[PDB]
Subunit: 25 residues, 4 copies
Amino acid sequence: SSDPLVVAASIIGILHLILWILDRL
Amino acid sequence: SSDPLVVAASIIGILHLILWILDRL
Amino acid sequence: SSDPLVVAASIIGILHLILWILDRL
Amino acid sequence: SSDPLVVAASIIGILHLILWILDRL
Ligand SMILES: [Ca+2]
Ligand SMILES: [Ca+2]
Ligand SMILES: [Ca+2]
Ligand SMILES: [Ca+2]
Ligand SMILES: [Ca+2]
Ligand SMILES: [Cl-]
């Protein structure tokens, strides 16, 4: 398990990547 | 909980994102 | 140890970096 | 504490940011 802040940061990072990909596609 | 280094990295990453957004807006 | 979500996010981030470098090279 | 993989990823991310800043400056 991780600090809740780190979990949130990881989810934001993933969604950032996905939104970038979809924008480019 | 997480390694203090990872917590710091996560906070830096978040603030990086926010500053980028505000710059673009 | 970390939340499985955070581990996945970290691996994705690393591979993102590597693919970017290889693209640029 | 965190998974060693996550710690490494966090350090890489930080150094990535620092190198980017120095390049821009
Ligand atoms: Ca905490
Ligand atoms: Ca932990
Ligand atoms: Ca430590
Ligand atoms: Ca969990
Ligand atoms: Ca492990
Ligand atoms: Cl963690």
